[PDB]
Design a protein around this ligand. Structure first.
Ligand SMILES: Cc1cc2nc3c(=O)[nH]c(=O)nc-3n(C[C@H](O)[C@H](O)[C@H](O)COP(=O)(O)O)c2cc1C
Length: 147
């Protein structure tokens, strides 16, 4: 099974999340290709992956903004080959803001509308992902099981 994890992370939290997930997946036998959103190109990006996991933290005060590096890919999601793709989303936020992890919701909804198959509800991490390591591993586990 080949997975692609693309993450947008400004202070490295969701990046830490992506790494924890990648390892969980790799320890399970998946081939895992992780990429920083800042570096990727959207066209055909999901092509050949059995599963795509998109990580993005949430910014904004009264307006949901996606982590800066992710925005270009977000805006080009229709160019990735997501139709029919098993995907799951994750991101770091903080529940004291108005839209907790609203970026996870935005990406998921876009995927859903592109016809991707959301295999698991989005992992929304409130606070430092390092304090939620267990939630991350159980989530990585549950997505492998939802495929
Ligand atoms: C000015 C500011 C605005 C933020 N806005 C939101 C928000 O609207 N919703 C949310 O859940 N988290 C919000 N966060 C929390 C960040 O998403 C959180 O710090 C996250 O750990 C950052 O992850 P990063 O390293 O991957 O990019 C905000 C943080 C800051 C400093």
């Amino acid at each position: 099974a080949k997975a692609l994890i693309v993450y947008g992370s400004t202070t490295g939290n969701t990046e830490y999340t992506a790494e924890t997930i990648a390892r969980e997946l790799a320890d399970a036998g998946y081939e895992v290709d992780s990429r920083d959103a800042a570096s990727v190109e959207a066209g055909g990006l999901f092509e050949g992956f059995d599963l795509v996991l998109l990580g993005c933290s949430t910014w904004g005060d009264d307006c949901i903004e996606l982590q800066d590096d992710f925005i270009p890919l977000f805006d080009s999601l229709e160019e990735t080959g997501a139709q029919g793709r098993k995907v799951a989303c994750f991101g770091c936020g903080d529940s004291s803001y108005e839209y907790f992890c609203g970026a996870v919701d935005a990406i998921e909804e876009k995927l859903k509308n592109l016809g991707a198959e959301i295999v698991q509800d989005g992992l929304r991490i409130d606070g430092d992902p390092r304090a939620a390591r267990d939630d991350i591993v159980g989530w990585a586990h549950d997505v492998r099981g939802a495929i």
